[PDB]
Design an enzyme around this catalytic site. Structure first.
Site, PDB file in Angstrom:
ATOM      1  N   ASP A   1      -7.434  -2.534   4.382  1.00  0.00           N
ATOM      2  CA  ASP A   1      -7.228  -1.998   5.540  1.00  0.00           C
ATOM      3  C   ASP A   1      -6.601  -0.505   4.637  1.00  0.00           C
ATOM      4  O   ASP A   1      -5.525  -0.773   3.943  1.00  0.00           O
ATOM      5  CB  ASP A   1      -6.558  -2.783   6.931  1.00  0.00           C
ATOM      6  CG  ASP A   1      -6.242  -1.851   8.156  1.00  0.00           C
ATOM      7  OD1 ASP A   1      -7.050  -0.172   7.632  1.00  0.00           O
ATOM      8  OD2 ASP A   1      -6.273  -1.630   8.780  1.00  0.00           O
ATOM      9  N   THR A   2      -7.221   0.037   4.195  1.00  0.00           N
ATOM     10  CA  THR A   2      -6.830   1.211   3.291  1.00  0.00           C
ATOM     11  C   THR A   2      -6.028   1.983   4.367  1.00  0.00           C
ATOM     12  O   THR A   2      -5.228   3.289   4.212  1.00  0.00           O
ATOM     13  CB  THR A   2      -8.323   2.596   2.481  1.00  0.00           C
ATOM     14  OG1 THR A   2      -8.819   3.320   3.994  1.00  0.00           O
ATOM     15  CG2 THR A   2      -8.377   1.479   1.594  1.00  0.00           C
ATOM     16  N   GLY A   3      -6.328   2.092   5.899  1.00  0.00           N
ATOM     17  CA  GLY A   3      -5.481   2.877   6.591  1.00  0.00           C
ATOM     18  C   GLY A   3      -4.628   2.579   6.978  1.00  0.00           C
ATOM     19  O   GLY A   3      -3.290   3.112   7.554  1.00  0.00           O
TER      20      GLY A   3
END
EC number: 3.4.23.16
Lengths: 99, 4, 99
Positions: free
Chosen positions: A25-27
């Protein structure tokens, strides 16, 4: 590996001797894993919501393996519906976005 | 993060 | 490009002839952009709760450019606190995770 994003980037992680599915999850800044036993000392933390929503346990220096790639860092352990591997750990495995 |  | 995750993966996107900063978010299935004028027809959706909070226009077939990569897809356009590019557009620019 190279993970395409046609589907959610769910991968197998190994943590506390256990195999789990987790979302890359790059967020996400940090990594939250579902309720489980880890051997450390921890620190109580609140995460989510507007100033904290769920109580989690912050375990530092945790070895986790993400698709065969070992990393160590802080894992928060709590009632998350989704195991989330955040950037704190994505950077440890040398994970980049590429296009 | 979830966001969608 | 190849984007590291030490910092938030914020890139310049072009949308509506404007340049906006947006988060490449592998944890997002969809794409939410700050309120702005886009041409034509859209449908009301609500987003922000489990169910929904914030009034956003669903615009289909929106062209977005990211670092020289054109993508067309569905964009939710309203007062999100962060512009978020999710998988629906990340796949269109050939964006993968790599480690």
């Amino acid at each position: 590996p190279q993970i395409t994003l046609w589907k959610r980037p769910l991968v197998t992680i190994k943590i506390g001797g256990q195999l789990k599915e987790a979302l890359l999850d790059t967020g996400a800044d940090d990594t939250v894993i579902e309720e489980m036993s880890l051997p450390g000392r921890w620190k109580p933390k609140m995460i989510g919501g507007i100033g904290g929503f769920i109580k989690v346990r912050q375990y530092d220096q945790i070895i986790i393996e993400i698709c065969g790639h070992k990393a160590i860092g802080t894992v928060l352990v709590g009632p998350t519906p989704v195991n989330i591997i955040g950037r704190n750990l994505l950077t440890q495995i040398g994970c980049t976005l590429n296009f | 993060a979830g966001a969608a």
